[PDB]
Amino acid sequence: QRAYANVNTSLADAMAVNILNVKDARTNVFWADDAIRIVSQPIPANHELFAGMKTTSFSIPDVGLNGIFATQGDISTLSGLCRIALWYGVNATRPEAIGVGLPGQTA
Amino acid sequence: ENRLESILSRFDADWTASDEARREAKNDLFFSRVSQWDDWLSQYTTLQYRGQFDVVRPVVRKLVSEMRQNPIDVLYRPKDGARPDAADVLMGMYRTDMRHNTAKIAVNIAVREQIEAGVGAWRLVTDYEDQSPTSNNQVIRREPIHSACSHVIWDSNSKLMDKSDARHCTVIHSMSQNGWEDFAEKYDLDADDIPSFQNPNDWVFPWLTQDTIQIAEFYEVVEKKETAFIYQDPVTGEPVSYFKRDIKDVIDDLADSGFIKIAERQIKRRRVYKSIITCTAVLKDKQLIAGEHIPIVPVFGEWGFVEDKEVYEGVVRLTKDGQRLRNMIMSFNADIVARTPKKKPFFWPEQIAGFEHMYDGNDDYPYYLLNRTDENSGDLPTQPLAYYENPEVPQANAYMLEAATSAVKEVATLGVETYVFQDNLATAMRRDGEIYQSIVNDIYDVPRNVTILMAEVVDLATGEKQVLNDIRGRYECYTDVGPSFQSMKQQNRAEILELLGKTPQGTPEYQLLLLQYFTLLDGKGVEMMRDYANKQLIQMG
């Protein structure tokens, strides 16, 4: 367990915490490329929603993601619905590798 | 009125019309190539045993091998009343530019997709070559089309197996970032503006990264009466006809070389235009391509129409139900084998209290002891020992496994033989020969044979470019199907052997043997033998 240590000492009773952001400032972000990660999944075909909807793949340009282009029609009112669903999740798997640069943090 | 709106209207109509067949074909492709458990894009599914006990794939392998053992290629034969050697040059050109690996690979891909899904296709393209050209510093090569069912979309109002009456066809290209840069470099597009089109693929397997960049190519055929020019060939030639659109820059160089115009007619012909399109804009508008037909050749399995609706089928569609039932039954039986308590005795704790170590499974004792007396009930009640029943596969499971396997075996019988599939490949090859002949007439340099030698009449413009001069006597040979040969020498050798097989042992047999020796390859000994054969053939006049 000691091989995973990252700090020199533990929190010893009444220790003073310092807030490192004291003024509002637009952030600059530096990271290692494998720290922020995006997991994308297609909508399941037989979901509770998208019940009577015909679905096809829909590739989103720019970002390398796909989504579900679902479509349904109504016969009572001669209308229809479209739904472009994009199911994705952002994860910060190495927060100790992600950083933040705050300029002008004067007291 | 908008060109993009018209193109997209046509494409949308075709996509909607050909929807169900495409879904079925894609399902058969994925079923027969990746996995029979088409149950990934689904929720409420826990982790259970799912095995794939295939019984259809060996049949597909057998059919593919049987179709592969019997190659089929075009064979150009002279028409009725034409010169007997009217097709030798065209046949040589076809063999020369179709002997390469890409043609065979594309044909094999189309055949495999026909057997599995029901429809395949390939394409014919023209490229500039400077090292080993076939003719006019250009070559024609055959390229593959993967997943033709979802990637090639034909005109909805086409009622032919080879789609020769279709007036337009769209091919969807899907690629990653490097592929999009490649395409942009090749076709002089803007690589910065990422294109988009209808996605032909579908997310059905946990693939790490699917393709995102889509674009489309639209081929259209326009049949019209254009103007032709009737000249007088300087080399004792009858009135020779050319197309004004073709000979437009050498219009004065013809007269300079010695061509005098005699008259001007109007001859109907077809012309093919390609447009590179996305879902938002048209990049290339009407780039004219060579030939008279759409350069895409389709190959079909069981093909027909039901109610103005195209249907095609291979060998996998019908066996799917039985295969899925057999897989399910085997999975259930594996669950029965695994998660079922074994056959062990049922004991009251007081029956074996004290003698626990005798029943664990060791073999240090000659018998098992049981407690007899109870301090409250006097004596322990007597009951015959019971054991947990052994696991058993139910009669329903067994009989359904057998019945499903029998049904799959019964229904996965193409023919009694792949005769019809070889006939659809042959029809595709006939259409390929038609398209190739048209493209050759459009771009290649075909000599004309005179009975007075092959006279090549060509001229160069002021920009040093050479414009081919092809007379309208271009359809002198028709298309047939024969064995695939790498070269005209191989074809001649096969013909000589076939004649020898039926000629009796006489003077024609001697002639045919000497001809076979004449048409042999060259080392040293066969060189000596062929020289002897040539000497004998010359000496007998």
* Tokens read off for A24: 């509002």
Residue B214, chain A, CB below 8 Å: the answer is yes
Tokens for B85, please give them: 């050697």
Residues 6+ away with beta carbon under 8 Å from B144: B102, B105, B106, B109, B110, B122, B123
Could you tell me which chain B residue has the CA closest to the CA of A60? B212
Rounded distance between C-alpha atoms, residue B197 and residue B278, angstroms = 5
Angle (CA) B251 B254 B260, round 5°: 105
Distance from chain centroid for Cα B98: 15
Provide the shortest C-alpha distance from residue B202 to chain A (in Å): 6
CB contact set of B183 (below 8 Å; sequence gap of 6+): B173, B175, B189, B215
Per the structure block, which two tokens stand in for A43? Answer: 């909508």
For helices B395-411 and B320-338, the axis angle rounded to 10 degrees is 150
Where is B203: in which H helix or E strand? none
The answer to whether the CB atoms of A60 and B212 lie below 8 A apart is: yes
- Give dist(CA B479, CA B74) in Å, integer: 7
Do B213 and A47 lie within an 8 Å CB cutoff? no
Q: How far is B52 from chain A (nearest CA, A)?
A: 22
Question: Within 10 Å of residue B527's Cβ, how many Cβ atoms?
Answer: 12
CA distance B411 to B317: 10
Task: Say yes or no for a CB contact (<8 Å) between B213 and A59.
Answer: yes
Report the C-alpha gap between B94 and B446 in whole angstroms. Answer: 12
Contacts of B208 in chain A (CB under 8 A): none
* B300-309: Cβ within 8 A, 24+ apart: B300/B114, B300/B118, B300/B119, B300/B161, B300/B424, B300/B428, B301/B114, B301/B115, B301/B118, B301/B119, B301/B421, B301/B424, B302/B118, B302/B420, B303/B118, B303/B161, B303/B424, B305/B159, B309/B17, B309/B20, B309/B21
Element (H, E) at B100: none
Tell me the technique behind this structure: cryo-EM
| B201 and A CB contact within 8 Å | yes
Q: DSSP character for B135?
A: B
CA atoms of B148 and B114, how far apart (whole Å): 9
In the 8-state DSSP scheme, what is residue B345? B
Name the residue among A44, A57, A58 with its Cβ closest to that of B42. Answer: A44
Cβ <8 Å between B212 and A44: no
How many residues can be counted in chain B? Answer: 541
CA distance B356 to B358: 6
Closest residue by Cα to residue B73 from B93, B94, B87: B94
Cβ pair B42:A45 closer than 8 A: yes
> Could you tell me which chain B residue has the CA closest to the CA of A58?
B199
For B332, counting Cβ atoms within 10 Å of its Cβ (0-12 exposed, 13-18 middle, 19+ buried), the class is middle
**How far apart (Å, rounded) are the C-alpha atoms in residues B214 and B278?**
8
User: What is the CA angle B476-B482-B487, rounded to 5?
Assistant: 80
In the sheet where B138-145 sits, what is the strand order? B138-145, B119-128, B296-300
Residue for token pair 């001229």: B459
B503 and A CB contact within 8 Å? no
Query: A62 — contact with chain B (CB < 8 Å)?
Result: yes
Cβ atoms of B218 and B11 within 8 Å: the answer is yes
**What DSSP letter does each residue of B364-405 carry, written as one string?**
S-SS-----EETTTEEPPP----BPPPP---HHHHHHHHHHH
Which residue in A has a C-alpha nearest to residue B42's C-alpha?
A: A44
User: Which residue in this structure is represented by tokens 């291979």?
Assistant: B314
Whether chain B has a CB inside 8 Å of the CB on A49: the answer is no
Chains A and B: how many Cβ contacts under 8 Å? 41
CA distance B109 to B121: 8
Q: Report the alpha-carbon distance of residue B355 to residue B370 in Å, rounded.
A: 7
- A61 at B interface, C-beta within 8 A: yes
- Distance between CA atoms of residues B291 and B126, nearest Å: 10
| Chain A touched by B199 (CB under 8 Å) | yes
Contact B412, B59 (CB under 8 A): yes
Q: Would the CB atoms of A57 and B194 count as touching at under 8 Å?
A: no
Q: Is A57 left (phi over 0), alpha (psi -120 to 50) or beta?
A: beta
* Record: contact A59-B211, CB cut-off 8 A: yes
The most distant pair of C-alpha atoms in chain A lies apart, rounded to whole Å, by 71
d(CA B219, CA B224): 16
What the block records as the tokens of B200 is 């032909």
DSSP run (H or E) holding B275? strand B260-277
Give the closest of B43, B196, B212 to A47, CB-based: B43
Taking residue B282's Cβ as centre, other Cβ atoms within 10 Å add up to 16
- Beta-sheet pairing, A36-40 with B73-78: unpaired
- What is the phi/psi pair of residue B50, to 5°? -140, 100
Nearest residue to B445 via CA among B435, B454, B456: B456
A73 touches chain B (CB under 8 A): no
Q: What is the spatial distance between Cα B260 and Cα B336, in angstroms, rounded to a whole number?
A: 91
Measure the CA–CA gap between B190 and B183, rounded to whole angstroms.
Answer: 10
Breaks in chain B (C to N > 2.5 A) come right after 416, 452
CB contact under 8 A, A66 and B196: no
Name the 3-class secondary structure at B201. coil
Check residue B238 and report its DSSP letter. P
In chain B, which residues have their Cβ closer than 8 Å to the Cβ of A61?
A: 194, 196, 212-213
Report resolution (Å) to 1 decimal.
Answer: 3.2
- Grouping H, G, I as helix, E, B as strand and the rest as coil, residue B411 is helix
Interface with A, mutate which of B202, B205, B207, B208 (most A CBs under 10 A): B202
Here the tokens at position A104 are: 């002008």
Collapsing DSSP to helix, strand or coil, B104 comes out as helix
CB-based contact, A44 to chain B, within 8 Å = yes
Three-state secondary structure along chain A?
A: CHHHCCCCCCCCCCCCCCCCCCCCCCCECCCCCCCEEEEECCCCCCCCCCCCCEEEEEEECCCCEEEEEEEEEECCCCEEEEEEECCEEEEECCCCCCCCECCCCCC
CB A6 within 8 A of CB A96: yes
